[PDB]
Amino acid sequence: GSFVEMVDNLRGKSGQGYYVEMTVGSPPQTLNILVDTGSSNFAVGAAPHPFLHRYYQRQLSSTYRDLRKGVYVPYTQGKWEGELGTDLVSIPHGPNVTVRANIAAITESDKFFINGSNWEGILGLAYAEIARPDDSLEPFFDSLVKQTHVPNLFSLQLCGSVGGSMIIGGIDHSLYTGSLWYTPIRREWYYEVIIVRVEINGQDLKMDCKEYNYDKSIVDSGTTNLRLPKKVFEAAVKSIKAASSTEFPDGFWLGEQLVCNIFPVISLYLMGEVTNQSFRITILPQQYLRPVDCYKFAISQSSTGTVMGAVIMEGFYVVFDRARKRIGFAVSACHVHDEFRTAAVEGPFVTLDMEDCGYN
Ligand SMILES: Cn1c(N)nc([C@H]2C[C@H]2c2ccccc2)cc1=O
């Protein structure tokens, strides 16, 4: 319940993700590694791309083993491609273990590394089902749990240069206030959850909740914003527009221009652990209005579903309880609040037909 060694082990810059220090090979080579709950490959810079501070030098590692296979990863607006192998991996500000993990040595990329960023690789923390090239390539966390006695969970306190904590194998009670509330992981592929109701300021959207999860709702540290299906984003914006009648152009709502409280709180009710029981997590404009005093509207549309990104996660201590296929949310001890409104996790609530909120 206390892991001081791991507190404050995350750094980053706004909009460029949160990274943890890791070492790969023998002797250990230090890299900064982006923490990504929305993918499942451990992949690292292995060549002197000009944006890279450093990169994995396989020729220096006695423990490197070639898998003699490639892997090609296109994503929304970019790509990476690499060469698979395994090597010894540790986390200096994490548990005192060393694991043999799969590593993709990145040898070609496009719009993947960021000019001016301070990380050199990515740690995919989601499940094997979305691993590349297929589900046979064991994700890092699976390897860590299989080879050591680290419990099958991790938790994230994303604070917002930004800071935070990744507690590997446990929960640190100093990182949150009040109680953790858990929502089931619906399917172990992404960290998929079911949103059951949406309020802005207090007002239900009265949408068929099946929409809120079309075709997915995921928890993703690798995304900055809260991302909504269009049909849901359309209605969501509509009410935030009306909630904010006192004062902005139409492009601002599409995040096509920047804007330099009158803003409503956003509540998502998540499926609870018990039949007909839910809970709600409440966030602020502080969360969906991120400084770029110009701010970007941090809610946007998706064809792949709801994405609960740093906009949501920075409100809360988030527990990825893999052992029990559930994700816990508590008010984060670091979240940024004013004197009037603070982020909230409240339950229980009575919500019927929560099964119908998910898409098959
Ligand atoms: C939202 N998202 C997430 N979570 N992961 C990826 C994986 C491609 C790798 C990635 C992570 C972070 C930044 C850029 C690329 C793509 C991506 O678009």
Atom of ligand 1 nearest to the CA of 307: 1
- DSSP, collapsed to helix, strand or coil, labels residue 313 as helix
Going by C-beta distance under 8 Å and a sequence separation of 6 or more, which residues neighbour residue 182?
Answer: 272, 273, 319, 321, 324, 326, 327, 328, 329
Domain membership flag for residue 246: yes
Q: How far apart are the first and last CA of the chain?
A: 37
Q: Is 243 exposed, middle or buried (0-12, 13-18, 19+ CB in 10 A)?
A: middle
Distance 17 CA to ligand 1 centre (A): 10
The Cα–Cα gap between 184 and 346 comes to 16
The Cα–Cα gap between 356 and 197 comes to 12
Q: Which of 96, 127, 150 is the last residue of a domain?
A: 150
Q: What technique determined this structure?
A: X-ray
Domain membership flag for residue 5: no
Q: How many CB atoms lie within 10 A of CB 242?
A: 11
Question: Which residue puts its alpha carbon closest to atom 2 of ligand 1?
Answer: 222
Residue of 20, 34, 39, 302 with the most ligand 1 atoms within 8 Å of its CB, for mutation: 39
The Cα–Cα gap between 231 and 317 comes to 29
> Residue 52 to residues 136, 156, 256: CA-CA distances in angstroms?
30, 26, 29
Residues assigned a catalytic role:
36, 220
Is the Cβ atom of 122 under 6 angstroms away from ligand 1? yes
Q: Is 104 exposed, middle or buried (0-12, 13-18, 19+ CB in 10 A)?
A: buried
Count of CA atoms in the C-beta half-sphere (13 A) of 215: 3
Question: Which residue puts its alpha carbon closest to atom 11 of ligand 1?
Answer: 222
| 257 and 225 within one domain | yes
| 145 and 156 within one domain | no
Is the Cβ atom of 220 under 6 angstroms away from ligand 1? yes
Is the Cβ atom of 136 under 6 angstroms away from ligand 1? no
Q: Is 165 exposed, middle or buried (0-12, 13-18, 19+ CB in 10 A)?
A: buried
Domain membership flag for residue 322: yes
Cis geometry, peptide bond prior to residue 285 (ω within 30 degrees of 0): no
DSSP string, 187-254: SBTTBB--EEEEEETTEE----TTTTTSS-EEE-TT-SSEEEEHHHHHHHHHHHHHHTTT---HHHHT
| 162 and 145 within one domain | no
Single out the residue of 352, 330, 308 nearest to residue 196, CA to CA.
352
Single out the residue of 289, 283, 348 nearest to residue 314, CA to CA.
283
Pairing of strands 29-36, 121-124: parallel
The Cα–Cα gap between 103 and 89 comes to 9
Q: Are 105 and 44 in contact (CB under 8 A)?
A: yes
Distance 243 CA to ligand 1 centre (A): 32
Domain membership flag for residue 311: yes
Q: Are 139 and 181 in contact (CB under 8 A)?
A: no
Single out the residue of 290, 244, 295, 234 nearest to residue 265, CA to CA.
244
| 156 and 145 within one domain | no
Distance 244 CA to ligand 1 centre (A): 32
Range(s) of the domain holding residue 79? 18-150
Token pair, residue 216, equals 């997915």
Can you give the CATH number for the domain in which 253 is found? 2.40.70.10
| 259 and 128 within one domain | no
3-state DSSP percent of the chain in helix, strand and coil, to 5:
15, 40, 45
Tokens 């002197």 correspond to 48
Is the Cβ atom of 309 under 6 angstroms away from ligand 1? no
Domain membership flag for residue 9: no
Count of CA atoms in the C-beta half-sphere (13 A) of 204: 9
Single out the residue of 176, 189, 177, 185 nearest to residue 139, CA to CA.
189
Token pair, residue 190, equals 């992404």
- DSSP, collapsed to helix, strand or coil, labels residue 142 as helix
Number of structural domains in the chain: 2
- DSSP, collapsed to helix, strand or coil, labels residue 354 as helix
Q: Is 6 exposed, middle or buried (0-12, 13-18, 19+ CB in 10 A)?
A: buried
- DSSP, collapsed to helix, strand or coil, labels residue 105 as strand
How open is the CA angle 138-142-145, to the nearest 5 degrees? 145
Distance 155 CA to ligand 1 centre (A): 19
The Cα–Cα gap between 219 and 193 comes to 7
CA 264 from chain center: how many Å?
24
The Cα–Cα gap between 263 and 258 comes to 16
The Cα–Cα gap between 70 and 63 comes to 19
Is the Cβ atom of 71 under 6 angstroms away from ligand 1? no
Long-range contacts of 76-79 (CB under 8 A, 24+ apart): 77/111, 78/109, 78/110, 78/111, 78/112, 79/108, 79/109, 79/110, 79/111, 79/112
Distance 346 CA to ligand 1 centre (A): 31
Tokens 């994303």 correspond to 158
| 262 and 125 within one domain | no
| 84 and 181 within one domain | no
Q: Are 137 and 124 in contact (CB under 8 A)?
A: no
Q: What is the dihedral of CA 175, 180, 186, 192, to 10 degrees?
A: -30
The Cα–Cα gap between 243 and 200 comes to 8
Domain membership flag for residue 100: yes
Looking at this protein, which amino acid is placed at residue 107? Answer: T
Q: Is 34 exposed, middle or buried (0-12, 13-18, 19+ CB in 10 A)?
A: buried
Domain membership flag for residue 6: no
> What residues pair up with 297 in beta bridges, in sequence order?
289
Q: Give me the resolution in angstroms, 1 decimal.
A: 2.0
Tokens 């060549």 correspond to 47
Q: What is the dihedral of CA 291, 294, 298, 303, to 10 degrees?
A: -130
| 140 and 210 within one domain | no
Residue of 16, 36, 110, 123 with the most ligand 1 atoms within 8 Å of its CB, for mutation: 36
Domain membership flag for residue 161: yes
- DSSP, collapsed to helix, strand or coil, labels residue 343 as coil
| 27 and 138 within one domain | yes
Token pair, residue 335, equals 């979240």
| 218 and 109 within one domain | no
| 163 and 244 within one domain | yes
DSSP string, 2-66: --GGGTT-EEE-TTS-EEEEEEETTTTEEEEEEEETT---EEEE-S--TT-S----GGG-TT-EE
| 183 and 133 within one domain | no
The Cα–Cα gap between 229 and 306 comes to 6
Q: What is the CA radius of gyration of the chain?
A: 20
Single out the residue of 172, 141, 107, 176 nearest to residue 20, CA to CA.
141
Backbone angles phi, psi at 83, to 5 degrees: -115, 125
The Cα–Cα gap between 97 and 144 comes to 8
Q: Which of 93, 120, 150 is the last residue of a domain?
A: 150
Provide the sign of the torsion angle of the four alpha carbons 208, 284, 335, 299, taken in this order. Answer: positive
Going by C-beta distance under 8 Å and a sequence separation of 6 or more, which residues neighbour residue 219?
Answer: 37, 191, 193, 308, 312, 313, 318, 320, 327
Q: Which of 92, 118, 150 is the last residue of a domain?
A: 150
